[PDB]
Design a protein around this ligand. Structure first.
Ligand SMILES: CCCCCCCCCCCC[N+](C)(C)[O-]
Ligand SMILES: CCCCCCCCCCCC[N+](C)(C)[O-]
Ligand SMILES: CCCCCCCCCCCC[N+](C)(C)[O-]
Ligand SMILES: CCCCCCCCCCCC[N+](C)(C)[O-]
Lengths: 600, 598
């Protein structure tokens, strides 16, 4: 098992490797091979071209053997130029061929994570800001992309070139030259890395200061009115200036450190250049080496170290990318709380009854909320679930949609345990109008059609009619194509709730849940929407979970929960007669509204 | 001056005073040092190939192995030391200059910030924090990258190109000079024209990326709804198609980069081939040494290495200039509301407020006030109410002189507020707005904001007067509790109380409640009305309210209709007149009944 290993960068890359080498595409595998061949050709070319340069010099200094020297030197000089162009060509061709491979690999990693995030449990509560999340994901995407690019097209070719240069130097020079360049690379890498760590820290500080300065400016600009009201212009200006100065100081330190790293690198490289060139000319003095050799060695070294100029950045980036990618994999690795059983059958709703059978549940194991809740909702009946603050009624919908499983007990629809069926068929049987309904960032027509996968214009028109939102949409300039949500037209609470009702209407489920559906509405809006809800509950099993009893007073039967159990059951009149928990609650709510009516 | 072509040149010419300040002698010295480092660095990079040529020359002359080894050693060593020295000079110019760069861009930002504060409210500064922050981040990065590329890439390259032209001229060709000149011209032209297309492809890729990402985020943030409609596969597919569109666009963009690079390499390498071949030919005739070959080669490579990333540089410099131009446009934008020359301070001895035949609208095609006149006696509690066309929402903004009347005038005490300093005027005014805003800071910072040097005692007093003091006492950090986001979040009543407290710290003779209770629930409204009444004690108070019952206890009530004063008087006088106020009153009462009926 690959996961049975140390949690380092090597493990992350090993995990990513199947995406690059899919074994499902074969089109991409060919692209990978071709890209690797462009790498090899590009390297062969850049290694070859200095020899062409060396020989051109040799022909000019030892015209004795290669004549007409002019002809020989011309041929080699042209070979060198053509070689240079060829190296660039091979390199860009490998980039181009690979880019599809990279984009595909990362797209699939993203897709896998997205699917997994949809499979994970609600308790992670993905209720956060769009901007924060988007900035984070943007940042991570740029990071993983940069890491992948530097890895494949900078580090890898450089290892190829470094080994090649080592072999060639070995056969043809020194070999003290080999040890010298190897020690030089080792010093260069070690220096770059240790300096880069410090630099990354300064970078983080600088970035934090920048954010602080920017936030002060933005808080001021968005609150221009308040700054005017209190004549606070100078105060705001000063307040920005101090932060701006802190940032500038940090930035100065950060860029200064860049200069130190550059100087260190150039010092190492140039010591090696001096040593190698001196050694080469000295070797020439003894008739051991040609003068082309000087040119050869110099060129080979500059070609070697040119990709390593960036190494600090490359390092910082590769590291961050690896971290970010490990995070991807961690999510993919996190286990799924609610899963279908193996070979789970579909739920088959012939008669849409709902049973709670001795249900024990809580969100967390240290706080049990339902303590053995049992009840039967008859097929086609309209029932309400009410209770005081500790009843556990807010769990019901989430249990029914199997966002969570009971600790003990079970829930049945039409005699089938909902834990043992496919989640999709189960959810297919259920409609919900929640308290706060959320709209996608898209058109109102899209938001209504969302109830069913292939929803037609006719179906949407029908639902919007049944939701009595059809006219409101007709009066919109752009109609069903009116964009809604944030960054879109703002809808009133009743309008949004109507879109939600319409949505479930498009769904057309046998069982429907009103989950505090009117609880966030004003009184008149509530009274308006209740008649619509009454209509849409027509021939379905309807469970209405409500705070305000008067809104559910017309139910076929009412389930009264107290302390995570069924305390009271019956019609509104039966419950008023029993003079128990429901009656008390009723009385209290009546009193409240009277008091509210008093204040005029 | 500004009377110029308005190209990159004008933007840069404007920016030069920031780089060469005339207020900071130290930064001016830093600029001189940086320029010296540019000149040393260039001199070094031009010199070091000559050291190389001669080392080659020594090994070719070169008759035997006698004193050449020493000379060749000396010259290779000079070459290596030259390389290192050039880098050292380059980083030293960067290090020396960086402070100049940081200060210049800081002062430019500071100027834009200050002008934005002087500019009109009408610049509709209602936006999302993330968007504005994103735009400013992008722009700062833009101007920075631009400034760096301009100073430390383009300029040294111009120096080097001229130097290379002169040197090639004196020592070669001059077919070599023209050949390199043509090489650069073709190189730049090609890079530019390809880059324009590339920037377009980049923009497409970015919109596509934004769309895919938006789809994913909208899905994840709506996990509940997606579960409710069993819509996971659908969202997955929705993301996948967007993701593919993006990937395709990215591939096109990078392909175009490959094409630009290949074209560039074609130009560079043709020039290389030609120069070196011609040099070898000259050598064959003894006109040129063989060191000359390397010399030529090194010069050309050194020349073209900065022009490797010219595309990016170009794109960047372009965008930077655009963004900087934008900055300058704001600084240039004219200020709608200004103090008159030598404007006296406003002096409030008796805090009356007069509207004298005020004609106003936010835009000249929609007139809102049609000649509004009224008098508010010093120390009275007055309310301003009206039906939908009254123009009452203008009053506060007019009184604080966010705008001037098209016609007519506003007086405080006896003085036209258009002829006094804006600061003295706003110092006499306190406001509690409908939506009260908290800065992202402590509660104490937020209350103390009312007066510039406000003490903790003053904050305590204001918070006491606003009756929010107990609430703060029960906070662990008390007045040092952070609020806003991410800070402790306050109820509407708590926020309105902080707003009241802020105004108490100002302690103004004139206080405006501008739909102050409009966003509050009923109980909160009733609670805060006693605090508001108490806080009105020895000030002139003007309350603009939608709901008449909240202002029925006023000294006098001004009723506006169609931008003029329709009716005036006490609540009872107005009910007796059986006019507009009475009707409104009846209607609201009926409405309150209806809600209570249901
Ligand atoms: C907090 C980490 C959660 C991230 C997982 C979400 C995966 C889908 C988003 C990938 C977007 C790819 N992009 C930006 C190139 O379009
Ligand atoms: C699969 C390619 C696109 C995936 C998007 C990148 C994810 C963002 C990084 C997640 C968390 C980063 N970290 C470790 C700094 O917290
Ligand atoms: C509508 C956009 C307004 C742009 C003008 C605002 C300039 C204020 C300074 C913010 C710069 C922050 N910085 C430099 C520290 O990153
Ligand atoms: C340290 C840098 C301070 C300089 C201020 C830069 C803020 C740039 C905002 C530019 C926005 C212009 N626009 C509309 C073209 O996007």
């Amino acid at each position: 098992n690959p996961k049975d290993a140390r949690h380092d960068g090597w493990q992350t890359l090993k995990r990513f490797l199947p995406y690059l080498w899919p074994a499902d595409n074969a089109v991409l595998r060919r692209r990978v091979v071709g890209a690797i061949l462009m790498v090899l050709l590009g390297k062969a070319t850049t290694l070859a071209l200095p020899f062409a340069y060396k020989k051109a010099v040799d022909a000019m200094t030892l015209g004795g053997g290669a004549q007409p020297a002019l002809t020989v030197a011309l041929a080699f000089v042209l070979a060198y130029a053509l070689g240079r162009f060829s190296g660039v060509l091979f390199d860009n061709l490998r980039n181009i061929v690979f880019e599809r491979v990279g984009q595909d690999a990362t797209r699939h990693l993203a897709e896998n994570v997205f699917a997994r995030l949809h499979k994970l449990s609600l308790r992670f509560h993905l209720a956060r800001r769009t901007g924060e999340v988007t900035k984070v994901i943007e940042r991570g995407t740029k990071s993983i992309d940069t890491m992948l690019y530097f890895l494949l097209f900078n580090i890898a070719p450089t290892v190829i070139e470094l080994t090649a240069v080592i072999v060639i130097f070995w056969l043809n020079f020194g070999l003290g030259l080999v040890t010298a360049t190897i020690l030089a690379v080792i010093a260069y890498v070690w220096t770059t890395r240790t300096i880069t760590e410090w630099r990354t820290h300064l970078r983080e500080k600088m970035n934090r200061l920048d954010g602080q300065a920017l936030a002060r400016a933005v808080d001021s600009l968005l609150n221009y009115e308040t700054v005017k009201y209190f004549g606070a212009e100078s105060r705001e200006e000063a307040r920005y200036a101090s932060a701006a100065r802190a940032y500038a100081d940090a930035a100065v330190k950060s860029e200064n450190s860049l200069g130190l790293l550059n100087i260190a690198q150039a010092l190492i490289v140039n010591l090696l250049m001096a040593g190698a060139m001196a050694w080469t000319v000295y070797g020439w003095s003894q008739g051991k080496l040609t003068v082309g050799d000087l040119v050869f060695v110099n060129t080979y070294l500059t070609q070697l170290f040119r990709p390593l100029d960036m190494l600090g950045m490359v390092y910082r980036t590769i590291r961050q990318g690896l971290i970010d990618m490990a995070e991807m994999f961690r999510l993919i690795d996190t286990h799924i709380e609610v899963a279908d059983v193996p070979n789970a059958p579909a739920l088959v709703v012939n008669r849409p009854s709902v049973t709670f059978d001795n249900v024990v549940f809580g969100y967390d194991r240290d706080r049990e909320i339902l303590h053995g809740l049992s009840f039967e909702v008859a097929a086609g009946s309209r029932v309400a679930i009410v209770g005081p603050s500790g009843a556990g009624k807010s769990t019901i919908a989430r249990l029914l949609f199997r966002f969570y499983d009971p600790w003990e007990g079970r829930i049945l629809i039409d005699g089938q345990d909902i834990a043992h069926v496919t989640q999709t068929s189960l959810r297919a049987a259920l409609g919900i109008v929640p308290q706060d309904s959320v709209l996608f960032n898209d058109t109102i027509g899209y938001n209504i059609a969302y109830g069913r996968d292939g929803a037609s214009r006719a179906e949407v028109d029908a639902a919007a009619k049944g939701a009595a939102i059809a006219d409101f949409i007709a009066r919109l300039p752009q109609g069903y194509d009116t964009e809604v949500g944030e960054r879109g037209l703002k809808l009133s609470g009743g309008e949004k709730q109507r879109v939600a009702i319409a949505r479930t209407l498009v769904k057309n489920p046998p069982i429907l849940l009103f989950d505090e559906a009117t609880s966030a509405l004003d009184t008149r809006t509530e009274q308006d929407i209740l008649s619509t809800m009454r209509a849409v509950a027509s021939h379905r099993t309807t469970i209405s979970i409500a705070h305000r009893l008067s809104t559910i007073a017309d139910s076929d039967t009412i389930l009264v929960l107290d302390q995570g159990r069924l305390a009271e059951q019956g019609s509104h009149l039966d419950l008023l007669r029993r003079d128990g928990l429901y009656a008390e609650m009723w009385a209290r709510q009546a009193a409240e509204s009277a008091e509210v009516s008093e204040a005029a």
